[PDB]
Amino acid sequence: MFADRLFNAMERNEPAPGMVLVAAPSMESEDFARSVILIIEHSEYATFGVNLASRSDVAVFNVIPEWVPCVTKPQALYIGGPLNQQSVVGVGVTAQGVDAARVDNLTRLANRLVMVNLGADPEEIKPLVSGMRLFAGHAEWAPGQLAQEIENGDWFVAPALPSDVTAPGSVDVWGDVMRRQPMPLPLYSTF
Structure with a gap:
């Protein structure tokens, strides 16, 4: 997006357990690129989460x-x-x-x-x-x-669905989570 970072054009949902953090399309880190991190602990001491998009x-x-x-x-x-x-x-x-x-x-x-x-x-x-x-x-x-x-535009906070946690192996988790978000996020998904 030209105007600003993609996510800054979206609403800002409050992080909380049960929500997922969706990596921005431009995030390139090998450890975090195209990740969908489910928040499992959110306190004054730290936030912990687990990526749902990478099968070992x-x-x-x-x-x-x-x-x-x-x-x-x-x-x-x-x-x-x-x-x-x-x-x-x-x-x-x-x-x-x-x-x-x-x-x-x-x-x-x-x-x-x-x-x-x-x-x-x-x-x-x-x-x-x-x-x-x-x-x-x-x-x-x-x-x-x-x-x-x-x-900074690194993450889009959105609610997680049980289907994200139990997603079949043929499913592109980051891709599908992006497709169910408001426009224009689906235009940045890729399969």
Whole structure:
């Protein structure tokens, strides 16, 4: 866009758990280009999030095989971010009837999105979620840093959908999240 950075022509939704940070088309960093970062923690100390757009070549079975029954295909670890890549976290979609606030092993982000305690018994969790994906590594923003970057036009804050977390392997996550946003963002998606 000529007038200004693409996102500065859009509305500014407040960052919060359950929202995704969409990378600007011009962001070129190998670790963050075309990422869709789900915010999983947002406090005065930091903001943590996991990219939903990058599938790794590591199969869940080769790391935590006990969770494969609950993992939505592709059953591979997704690269959540450049930090703590040995750390794995699970994001699920609550099943009908479930209220995460009533389950110790499920932490609500927003709507039906939840954090799954991977230390829990997979058999306990299985009937409580209709989908789940595992993320190795995460991204962290120092205090005030996310605001600065948003002001710089680096990120577009938008709500996440369960379909972003359980997206099939043939789906272009960054591309499709951009296509469901107001014009002219869809004109910058690419497949």
